[PDB]
Ligand binder design. Structure first.
Ligand code: CL
Ligand code: CL
Ligand code: CL
Ligand code: CL
Ligand code: CL
Ligand code: CL
Ligand code: CL
Ligand code: CL
Ligand code: CL
Ligand code: CL
Ligand code: CL
Ligand code: CL
Ligand code: CL
Ligand code: CL
Lengths: 143, 138, 138, 137, 140, 135, 138, 135, 134, 134, 135, 142, 134, 138
């Protein structure tokens, strides 16, 4: 279009929104204890670092399934999630990386509104059309 | 039909640059470091107090203020590495970083941290586009 | 040139909307609240754990899960207010917010917080475009 | 094409904020006052919960704390957000991270949330109010 | 030489001590109506409950009145120690004293609280009103 | 009535003057500004109501060592109450910026009430109440 | 110095009044207490938090608000008494006051305090002119 | 007529004198003012009733940082009880302003009771009770 | 050797004494105590008490004898016979009780008892208990 | 009146014993102590000690006397005479000292000294100390 | 080669089997997998080297409550060392996800070393060393 | 005779063989002699120890640090005791030894203190000499 | 040949002793102890105790000898034979028990038992326990 | 009396050797210590951390590096000794061992501990076959 003297290419804008959407979708699946949708979004050889893994690098979805079968009783109180200061890094058409602060507003524990924070890194890989998480790193203490 | 073992060498490729990156960090060599980082590099680390930091500017300070690291031998070990290849220009490595240092009463101590490094191939050389360090140690 | 009498009423104007805003917050009236906030409202507050929050989405939680304050009588006082007028569509107010509440053993307690509210006049009514709170109200 | 002047207006605000921070960081009180409205208002850890007026209260840290002749300082402005309000009024909120030494000659990091309210007067931008949360400086 | 006019400063001071006692009784009985009657609308105050802030009006004080009824049953004895009055004109007085409160608690345990108080009085249309007060020593 | 405006500024000026005298360890000027039967409540008096200026003479004799610490005072949120033409009352937050305490800039806060009485032309403090830190 | 050893029953009278006085306090008998107290009596005691009190009003509060002497059987001991006869109209006695009480669950406990009682004879009956207590007991 | 007024001032003067002697570590003047069978309750005696001046002698002989330091004492809210012409009782708050701790000004409070007995012309302390911490 | 029987004697009255303590039997206690008795014990807070008066309170205001297991052990006792009518016994007193912990707890105390014979029976003229163990 | 003197007699030896202790003179100490002297003191850690051998140590490793002014007071002495040959004194021992920075401090201890007369002089047979001081 | 690959998987399988038996409180299967003269180091043994299976019977026999909370085990970063055809050594991180503690999900970690010896066909544990928490 | 005092007799010497190399290994460690140490360890040696913070470490690289930065192990007397040893023989080239390692050392001001640690050493015979293939230390020592 | 069986003999009586203790069976216990038995154990607070009287408190006031699943292990035993009527055994005593809500825990204590053969049966003449069990 | 009672002589012989043993320890006379200890002697002591030690090898270390007695005097007291004669060849002695040492800070201090010593005599000489200590001396 007009104004050729500059990168009129803002598909990077929509590509990033693409990544933000799948991340939101992933979080919703997690938040609703929907393990099926979750696995659908994760690469089988998915790798992860998270408080629940006590400093160990975990492989597969098997380890996460636990929390999706027991704590699945997730439905016991309201839980609003906010993704702050997102930053996406595009790497090829099949590879993306997103880092953001994850803020969770929940009740319970004494029945009072409380807020939890965690730093998250999600590494995305495009396979046969849909984006899948290949690795993620969570920092803080919340799930 | 022993096919696809170049993934084996590609992963070793990633392990080597990660080792190189850690050595540069460990030797306070900021020049080599920047050479290995994308200008728009993003990071999550204890020193950033929960904030997502951009650029190398924030890291320069720690490189310049430790200058004489010699005041103690520093050995690093990369444990249980795991590489994820994504295209020919994109890689992801996750490992436990163990650091053996002295100081603190000249006594030998060990620090652990979980690290994620996201690599992107630009014009021949690999560069870090994002990294996430969990723990608190150095 | 003491025509600075309208600045007197302009400031009272700002003090009134601030009082109105606080009342809406105090009564858990999220509708009135949103009516007074710009959609792209920005905020710094204890509940946000050091993060700059955007939109009203983050606030509608405490506005929809914090009504158990009837058995917890509340009174708010705005102390030492200071308004800064900037054009006819832009104002800034800073004050100490003191809250008297019960509970914590049916006993009377007092909380203090420093607040900054940035106001912008849009199509007739004043709206908050950004606010910064220090302390820990709710 | 135009609709990107808000883009340059915001960069304008980010520049004066950077300039302000540099003046503070270099203990240059003259440049500082030049950038502040005489009736400037402020909330900051050093004021112990009180709303302070004028630059008189700040002169103290530029004087009795310009003794940085023994340690270098680096400042980072994170996740900036500007709100434009008319052509003479702006509002910027950011996380201010400070890397300083001492405390054992060791590298340490400080964080603080800052809000700066800007007003355009006779050409140059001036701070009319600011709110600092956390502590750092 | 100074018999008359001195004998009256004596009664003027007792006058101030009486209103101060009355004020304290109203406070002690949670009687906000009598309290407001004794305070100037633009009354100013410094007190532990205000966390280092100068408070205006009676609005801030109503809270403690309305939320301290059980005290009705709670026996309360107040003592005003080492009073000092400063007369300033016929319509202006200043009194400073140590306020000691003897109260019970849970288990009916007797405890004592101390606070230094300054009350500034102004005569308006016949009755004395508090224009400013300063309370120290964290007690209520 | 606006002379109330100048009357209040009058009180603010003497208060500033008083603080300056205190800040400079100038006991002569101080006594000149205090009524002989001056009464006071302050942290240094440990909960006791002190009389006269005698008790304050000491924080002047042993604090004059100020030639080792620049001091700046700020009077915040002042509020004056006028009561007759010879009686005033001022309440304010007193913020003090001082060094030492290691050598680093520090800030102290205290709430102060000063009761003023006009005697033979000049204003004199008849009572004062300080709560906080400042000495 | 051996003549008129009456300074034996003289001191003994003082212990008699001091003992009476202590019984009144122990039984919650304000009337007896006042009879032995000069209306202009002053006191230093832990309950007065460092202040010097005058009159009997201050002490009345502990009598009026403590009638449960029922489940409150209390024993008192006056250790190492020392009387100072001043003239024939006055006396001063100092002793340790040990009191054994229950409560504290119903377990036996002991408290101690130093007391000074300054007596002065008005008419034929003695009265407490001033007293000072240190320690625990009330 | 009010001789009770002068009698009380008489007691206040000897108390001031006593405190000065104590403050200056002048044990001779002190003993001169105390009855040989003097009794005492004080923090330094750990809950015990002490007799004679022997116990106090230590604090003089071994506390000379008193001489090397400006010490200011204030007697607050004094109350005297007269009992006959040879017997008096005074109770007051004793406030002490001293330096040390690096030349820092600090304040100490103690409640004191002094029992006076007139013997052969001069007043002597027969018993005293100090509550708090001073000496 | 005749000294062993006269010492064993003292042990008997000491045991007898402790026996009465634990039985709330104040009457037997008084019989064994000299009216001018003196004492240093934890429940006296560093003061020397005189008489039996100060001791009734614990006899009366605490008869949880058949409520708790009051068992006392006298260890390493040493006796000093001083003339025909004067004895000194010093031992470690070990008590094992219940409740107030509900657990079988053990308490230790150094105890010195000074005896003196009067018209036949032995009586305590002074005792000194250190540690705390009631 | 005769008792008045005998009791006062026990107060003198007690003070002399203390004098010798304070002084650091062990020769005097032994002479006033019976060989079989038994003791309970804070340095024995709950143990009934026997003989002089255990106290010698404190007599040889605390000679820094002058290097510390020390004043003792004996409060509320109570003596029990038990026949011509034995006595018992109980008192509060208050000690005023410095050191630890030269700050005048005050220690307290409950003491019980049991005396037995051997020919000319009085000898301590047993003693009990509570608190911690000497 | 390529058999060292299957030999190691062989060891990983018996280790998994062992852990399952432990996890299900199945002492019979456990003993079947342990050499009678089995040696062990583990937190429950308080620093002592224990012999036989007798000592382990207690943790099985007395924690049957497992039949309540889902127990999931993960073997992380396994490392096998082959030594001859009848001897193997495996070291791994053992992560256990369990409930309880309020029916709340919690995770325990422990470092384990298992020494295997082939006897008459089947692999048997000859010694094991546990660091950490796990049952 | 009773068919065993021949074989039982060599298992006896084989176990002493293992106890000797273990003692040798400990001496090398105790003297900060990294060369002898590496000589006794298989290159692919694996280890679990307090210094590794719950991680399984590989190679000798990680241990080099405690040898090159522990030259003080040559300044003060160090006595080691191996208690309640237990050897498990597995083939002629494979052995396993478990023991309590007690260390008596000074300092902290020349003060004598004792440290305890449970150790497991897995030995493998390669080309004549015994080498450590894996070890697990729980407790403290080093 | 026989020292082997003599030692097993000692290990058996020690096991029997521990079982009696573990089952709160004081009768069997006393049967196995010499009347003048001496002991050092945590419950005695650093004091050397005599007789069985002191022990009858822990067997007695602890009738939860069921509600406490108890397994005992004797580790690294070492016997010293001294004559045909005297033996000494030292071992680590490990106890596996449950809890305040069935939690499995382990306690360790070092024990020394000194045995003396009297009229046929072995009796404990002295024992020393370190740790805190019973 | 009876041929017996001389048992006190046997008991006293043990008190003699026990004292000789303690004295040898304090001197730092390992040689004598060896002659007094059976080579297969067993021990329980705080310096062993819960483990039963055997032989005299483990104790050597203390007769070498522990030289605070080799330059600072210490007095030992044995209290309430109790002996059990199991024969003419076997003895058992139990006692509290108080130790008065100097420094540890410089101020005279006292340490306690109970010790059990089991003695066995071979060819005329008494030797300890086992000992158990509680507390922490040497
Ligand atoms: Cl996740
Ligand atoms: Cl980095
Ligand atoms: Cl808000
Ligand atoms: Cl600023
Ligand atoms: Cl009020
Ligand atoms: Cl002032
Ligand atoms: Cl009273
Ligand atoms: Cl004095
Ligand atoms: Cl008793
Ligand atoms: Cl002594
Ligand atoms: Cl297992
Ligand atoms: Cl090793
Ligand atoms: Cl037992
Ligand atoms: Cl030994």
């Amino acid at each position: 279009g007009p104004h050729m003297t500059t990168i009129e290419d803002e598909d990077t804008k929509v590509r990033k929104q693409e990544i933000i959407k799948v991340t939101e979708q992933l979080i919703e699946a997690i938040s609703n204890g929907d393990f099926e949708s979750y696995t659908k979004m994760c690469d089988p050889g998915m790798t992860a670092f998270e408080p629940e893994a006590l400093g160990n690098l975990v492989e597969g979805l098997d380890f996460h399934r636990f929390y999706f079968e027991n704590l699945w009783s997730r439905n016991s109180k309201p839980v609003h999630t906010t993704i702050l200061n997102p930053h996406i890094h595009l790497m090829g058409d099949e590879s993306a990386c997103i880092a953001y602060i994850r803020i969770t507003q929940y009740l319970d524990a004494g029945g009072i509104p409380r807020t939890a924070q965690s730093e998250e890194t999600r590494v995305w890989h495009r396979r046969d059309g849909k984006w899948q998480i290949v690795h993620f790193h969570r920092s803080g203490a919340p799930s």
